[PDB]
Structures are given as structure tokens and as C-alpha cells.
Design an enzyme around this catalytic site. Structure first.
Site, short mmCIF file in Angstrom:
data_model
loop_
_atom_site.label_atom_id
_atom_site.label_comp_id
_atom_site.label_asym_id
_atom_site.label_seq_id
_atom_site.Cartn_x
_atom_site.Cartn_y
_atom_site.Cartn_z
N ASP A 1 -8.33 -6.21 13.25
CA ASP A 1 -9.15 -6.07 12.08
C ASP A 1 -8.53 -7.02 11.41
OD1 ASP A 1 -9.75 -3.56 10.70
OD2 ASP A 1 -8.93 -5.49 9.03
N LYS B 1 0.61 -1.28 0.21
CA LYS B 1 0.07 -0.10 -0.07
C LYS B 1 0.70 1.52 0.16
CE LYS B 1 -3.85 2.25 1.01
NZ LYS B 1 -4.88 2.43 0.61
N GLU C 1 7.48 -9.99 11.32
CA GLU C 1 8.11 -11.67 11.38
C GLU C 1 7.28 -12.29 9.49
OE1 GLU C 1 6.08 -15.72 13.07
OE2 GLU C 1 5.27 -13.70 13.47
N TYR C 2 8.10 -12.93 9.42
CA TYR C 2 7.90 -13.98 7.81
C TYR C 2 6.72 -15.05 7.66
CZ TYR C 2 8.76 -16.30 3.70
OH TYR C 2 9.02 -16.80 2.11
N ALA C 3 5.32 -14.61 7.45
CA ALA C 3 4.91 -15.95 7.14
C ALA C 3 4.17 -16.38 5.75
CB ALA C 3 3.40 -15.20 7.81
N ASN D 1 -6.38 -9.21 6.16
CA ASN D 1 -5.07 -9.19 7.26
C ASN D 1 -4.91 -10.26 8.17
OD1 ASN D 1 -5.26 -6.12 7.14
ND2 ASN D 1 -6.77 -5.82 8.82
C1 LIG Z 1 -1.77 -7.82 -0.84
O1 LIG Z 1 -0.84 -8.83 -0.25
C2 LIG Z 1 0.32 -9.14 -0.04
C3 LIG Z 1 1.11 -7.95 0.04
C4 LIG Z 1 2.35 -7.82 0.67
C5 LIG Z 1 3.29 -9.64 0.10
C6 LIG Z 1 2.28 -10.15 0.72
C7 LIG Z 1 2.36 -11.09 0.69
N1 LIG Z 1 3.71 -11.64 2.37
C8 LIG Z 1 3.63 -13.01 2.72
N2 LIG Z 1 3.93 -12.71 3.72
C9 LIG Z 1 4.77 -12.05 4.77
C10 LIG Z 1 4.59 -10.48 4.56
C11 LIG Z 1 4.89 -10.32 5.83
C12 LIG Z 1 4.21 -8.58 5.67
N3 LIG Z 1 5.04 -11.15 6.18
N4 LIG Z 1 5.21 -12.37 6.24
C13 LIG Z 1 3.94 -14.12 1.93
C14 LIG Z 1 3.30 -13.86 0.95
C15 LIG Z 1 3.07 -15.00 -0.42
C16 LIG Z 1 2.84 -14.67 -1.84
C17 LIG Z 1 1.91 -13.64 -2.31
C18 LIG Z 1 2.22 -12.44 -1.32
C19 LIG Z 1 2.75 -12.81 -0.04
C20 LIG Z 1 0.88 -10.32 0.08
#
Ligand SMILES: COc1cccc(-c2nc(Nc3cc(C)[nH]n3)cc3ccccc23)c1
Length: 263
Positions: free
Chosen positions: A131, A18, A86-88, A136
């Protein structure tokens, strides 16, 4: 606790965001994989969010829970504010619900189990109105959810008008009517979510703001055929107009539909 762009190697973008994108980062010392949110100062500056960010950060800092995306810390530069998150590894619940259309009772009840824990701990820390809509929600490596509802972490770019109503569908009667509110607003969210996980769309979707105002204020929703008795029982209890007729989180975790279905 005094970080800089240089403590970190920078990988690819996890996705368009964003006020900036998220990037894979790796702490140079531990060799630990992390996510990096980029928040451009010129864009916060305009939108009118600068002090809202500041608010959310100083709060998210002191929240440690298996089902909440850890903020490890943050720091800025000339042009950018950087969130160290953190990384998800897996996607948002939103992306999952888009390929699938809907989750089964087992998965849904597990999702609800984890949001209840995150929520009860939130309430114990005096933190409310979270939220928890599906975009989210991130998925860690065990498929376990993580509430990511701050710093626009995983917010896709949007029109500003598109963001306004970001959360209308998840709002309780007492918030769209402008009356005052307590922790009970989270229990209503939970009910929306539960219905959304099972059917693939939240219960109060409509075209106009006004039509959505009507359906929410006077709690007009219906269940499709397939929604089972226990789920209707639970949703029904959570989506009550009167805030104080909503369950304690505890009785959500003890509800027999949840215990029949989670892990
Ligand atoms: C709009 O959706 C969004 C935006 C930014 C990142 C992702 C996204 N994030 C993560 N993991 C994350 C992100 C953060 C801050 N921690 N772990 C994994 C993903 C995998 C495939 C596509 C997208 C991914 C989605």
C-alpha cells in the site's frame, strides 16, 4: 527480543494515530531515538482487526530494506499493543505534497527509484500488494522514502467508512473487478504514484464509487499539458489494463526517464 514499556523513555506524540498515537521513544541502553506506535486493544477488538494485525506483524518482522520502515519488534500490556518502529524524522510524503501541490521530475523519479527497489526486494521475499499511497510514505533524514504501510503506523484517525476506500484510487482493474492477481499489481500502483507525484492528485479521482469503478476498469485517464514525454511514456506503460503488459521492475529502473532524472 523480549521487550517492555520500561526499556524506553517516552517523549512527545509525533501525531494522532488510528488505534493510538505514535510517540518519540529512546532506548534507555543505546540512547537510540525510535518511534512508538500505540495500538489500543479495545479498539482493535472492535473494528475486527486483531488477527489482521497479527498477520502483518509476523511478516514485517522479516523485512530489512533501506526503504522499508523497520519494525524492530513489539510487545503488549493490559490495554495496549506497542509497535517499536524506525523513526523517520521528516513527515509523510502526503504532508509534503500538501504544501507543495506536486513534485518536480527529479524528486518524483527518485521517489519512484526507491519504491522500485523496495518493491523488487518485496517480490523477492514473496511479498506483494504494498500500500504505497502517499500517507503510507515517511521521509527519513536524507529525504529518503520509507514504506510504512503496516500496523496503521502513520494512519490518521478515521471513520471506518473513510478507511474502507483508503486505497480504492490505487487499486488495479484486476482487484476492483474481483479477478485473481499477482506481483504485477505493484507495477500499477507505481504508475498511479508517479502520476500523483507529478500532478498532485491520482489519475482516477471521481465522486461516486461507481464512477471510480468505471474509470479504473476501463483505464480512463488524461495528462495535463506540463507532464513531459518520458513521464507519459512511463506512466502509460505502467497503467495498462493487462497485468502482464506491465514492465518488470527492472525495466522501470532502466527506463531512460528515471535515469535522466534520479540519483
Ligand atoms: C497522520 O500522520 C502521522 C501520524 C503519526 C505520526 C506522524 C509523523 N511521523 C513521523 N515519523 C515517524 C512516525 C513513525 C511511526 N516513525 N517515524 C514524523 C512526523 C513529523 C511531523 C508530523 C507527523 C509525523 C504522522
Amino acid at each position: 527480543r523480549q521487550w517492555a514499556l520500561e526499556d524506553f523513555e517516552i517523549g512527545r506524540p509525533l501525531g494522532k494515530g488510528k488505534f493510538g498515537n505514535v510517540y518519540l521513544a529512546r532506548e534507555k541502553q543505546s540512547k537510540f531515538i525510535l518511534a512508538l506506535k500505540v495500538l489500543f486493544k479495545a479498539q482493535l477488538e472492535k473494528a475486527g482487526v486483531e488477527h489482521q494485525l497479527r498477520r502483518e506483524v509476523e511478516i514485517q518482522s522479516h523485512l530489512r530494506h533501506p526503504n522499508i520502515l523497520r519494525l524492530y519488534g513489539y510487545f503488549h500490556d493490559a490495554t495496549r499493543v506497542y509497535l517499536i518502529l524506525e523513526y523517520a524524522p521528516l513527515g509523510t510524503v502526503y504532508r509534503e505534497l500538501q504544501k507543495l501541490s506536486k513534485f518536480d521530475e527529479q524528486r518524483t523519479a527518485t521517489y519512484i527509484t526507491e519504491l522500485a527497489n523496495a518493491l523488487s526486494y518485496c517480490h523477492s521475499k514473496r511479498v506483494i500488494h504494498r500500500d504505497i499511497k502517499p500517507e503510507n510514505l515517511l521521509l527519513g533524514s536524507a529525504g529518503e522514502l520509507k514504506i510504512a504501510d503496516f500496523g496503521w503506523s502513520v494512519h490518521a484517525p478515521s471513520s471506518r467508512r473513510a478507511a474502507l476506500c483508503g486505497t480504492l484510487d490505487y487499486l488495479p482493474p484486476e482487484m476492483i473487478e474481483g479477478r485473481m492477481h499477482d506481483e504485477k499489481v505493484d507495477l500499477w500502483s507505481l504508475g498511479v504514484l508517479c502520476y500523483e507525484f507529478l500532478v498532485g492528485k491520482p489519475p482516477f479521482e471521481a465522486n461516486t464509487y461507481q464512477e471510480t469503478y468505471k474509470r479504473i476498469s476501463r483505464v480512463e485517464f488524461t495528462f495535463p499539458d506540463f507532464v513531459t514525454e518520458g513521464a507519459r511514456d512511463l506512466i502509460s506503460r505502467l497503467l495498462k489494463h493487462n497485468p502482464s503488459q506491465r514492465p518488470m521492475l527492472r525495466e522501470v529502473l532502466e527506463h531512460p526517464w528515471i535515469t535522466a532524472n534520479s540519483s
